[PDB]
């Protein structure tokens, strides 16, 4: 390891120590609102009074920031220095600042947040000591002068070389570049960790979730050919969706639904995986819009998968959960919806499950068959299981009515079924 | 540009470990 490398390491360690006047004017001139000159000339007192006003406004907006006023925004906070504290106190600072960035990721359209974060930059040197958290915080505002300035003053950790090419230009970074960024595989793990933190602290919001889910969609879209890449990329996005469903916010539920839909339609998953996705969605379904989206997602997943045992009967627990969280009338009007999304394999499996399990709502079964335009082999499977249930259970008027419905619609298939097995 | 995955050298430093000779001992 060459001496040049070892000294580069030591320079990294001593990045934030101002060992002489010139280096100090650099570290102090880097700032968020004021240009280099005024930044270099002004003082901690001025910056801090602005910060106090701004954070007071933000606390008035929502009461959470008071703790930061207590711990990072005192005259003692004017006094202290990063460099002359011990390792433990350094970690405490880092935890506090990460929490503050998590809170402040939500109001990056407020000059109050701009001013307060400007204090934090200028006194605690976040723009050097901890830039991953800052970038991850503000990444979804990527079309804004605030983000352009963060790039201008930041030093880029090795993952963000795309933004590196866009530092100090004049045009904002583009969607395609952000898609390269996310298309990386390590950065995906990083951003996964960030979302996990956001969820566990219940600090998520629409615009952020929109950007996250759109980026994930485009990631799988660009990777829509390299199937090895898709296979190794499954665990990351599907774990993100797992936790995003474990959350409670309807926004999280919808985002997880969308990611799951696109991922399944772009890559054919296994029956067990699609089953588990169903189970989790059904477990955490709570409200109306989430219900709507989850139903569409399930339909699409079963229209995807295709293999031996394609439309087999749903397992007991999954079927019970599904009928618990969904009503026959609800699915009926869903079929009656004018769009009528193609629920073919899903409806077939649902019907077979009902036939094996309930054996009561046969008239709803009939309404289903009339409402949906089925297909040949699916109908044949239905007829086969119907023959089996007829030979097992007592004969029913609605049952023979179903048979008559088949007579009106392709009795000949009934004929093939019975001649293959029966009279 | 894409992220640079630079390979570097690895120098296996000293690896102090345990002693089964210390583990086994004579009776009283």
């Amino acid at each position: 390891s060459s001496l040049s490398d070892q000294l580069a390491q030591v320079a990294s360690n001593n990045a934030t120590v101002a060992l002489d006047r010139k280096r100090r004017q650099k570290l102090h001139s880097a700032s968020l609102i004021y240009n280099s000159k005024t930044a270099a000339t002004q003082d901690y007192d001025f910056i801090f009074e602005n910060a106090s006003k701004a954070l007071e406004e933000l606390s008035q907006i929502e009461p959470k920031f008071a703790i930061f006023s207590r711990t990072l925004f005192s005259e003692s906070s004017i006094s202290l220095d990063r460099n002359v504290q011990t390792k433990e106190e350094i970690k405490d600072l880092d935890n506090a600042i990460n929490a503050y960035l998590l809170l402040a990721s939500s109001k990056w359209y407020l000059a109050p947040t701009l001013h307060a974060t400007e204090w934090l930059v200028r006194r605690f040197q976040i723009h050097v000591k901890n830039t991953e958290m800052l970038l991850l915080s503000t990444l979804n505002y990527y079309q804004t002068p605030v983000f352009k300035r963060i790039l201008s003053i930041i030093k880029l950790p090795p993952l963000f070389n795309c933004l590196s090419n866009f530092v100090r230009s004049e045009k904002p970074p583009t969607a395609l570049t952000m898609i390269k960024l996310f298309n990386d595989m390590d950065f995906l793990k990083l951003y996964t960790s960030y979302l996990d933190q956001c969820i566990k602290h219940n600090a998520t919001y629409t615009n952020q979730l929109l950007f996250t889910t759109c980026c994930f969609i485009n990631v799988v879209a660009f990777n829509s050919n390299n199937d090895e890449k898709l296979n190794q990329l499954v665990p990351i996005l599907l774990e993100i969706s797992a936790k995003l469903l474990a959350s409670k916010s309807k926004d999280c539920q919808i985002a997880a639904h969308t990611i799951l839909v696109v991922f399944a339609t772009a890559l054919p998953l296994k029956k067990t995986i699609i089953l588990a996705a169903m189970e989790t969605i059904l477990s955490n379904l709570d409200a109306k819009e989430a219900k709507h989206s989850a139903l569409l997602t399930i339909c699409k997943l079963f229209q995807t998968l295709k293999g031996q045992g394609n439309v087999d009967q749903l397992p007991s627990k999954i079927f019970k959960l599904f009928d618990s969280k969904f009503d026959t009338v609800s699915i009926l009007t869903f079929l009656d919806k004018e769009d009528k999304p193609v629920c073919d394999k899903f409806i077939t499996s649902y019907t077979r499950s009902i036939a094996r399990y309930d054996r009561s709502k046969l008239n709803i079964i009939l309404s289903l068959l009339k409402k949906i335009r089925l297909e040949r082999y699916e109908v044949r499977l239905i007829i086969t299981d119907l023959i089996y249930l007829s030979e097992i259970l007592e004969d029913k008027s609605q049952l023979v009515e179903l048979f008559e419905y088949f007579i009106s619609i392709n009795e000949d298939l009934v004929l093939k079924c019975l001649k293959s097995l029966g009279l | 540009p894409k992220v640079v995955r630079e390979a570097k050298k690895v120098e296996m430093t000293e690896a102090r470990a345990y002693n089964a000779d210390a583990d086994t001992a004579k009776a009283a």
Binding site: A175, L176, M178, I179, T206, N207, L209, L210, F211, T213, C214, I217, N218, V220, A221, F222, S224, N225, K250, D251, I254, A255, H257, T258, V261, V262, T265, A266, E289, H292, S293, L296, K300, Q303, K306, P341, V342, E375, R376, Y377, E378, R380, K416, S420 | -
Partner: protein, 49 residues
């Protein structure tokens, strides 16, 4: 009819759908600001089906 006929019925039943090329979702980036989760989900479902 044979297992061959069963396979033929299977394949004749199976119908086409829209695929996922690498240039299909590059628009919600323009149209992503100040909208609602439901509307975004509907747009994705529209472009996918």
């Amino acid at each position: 009819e044979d297992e061959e006929d069963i396979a033929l019925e299977f394949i004749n039943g199976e119908k086409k759908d829209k695929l996922v090329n690498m240039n299909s979702f590059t628009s919600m980036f323009d149209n992503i600001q100040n909208v609602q989760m439901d509307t975004f989900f509907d747009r994705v479902m529209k472009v996918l089906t």
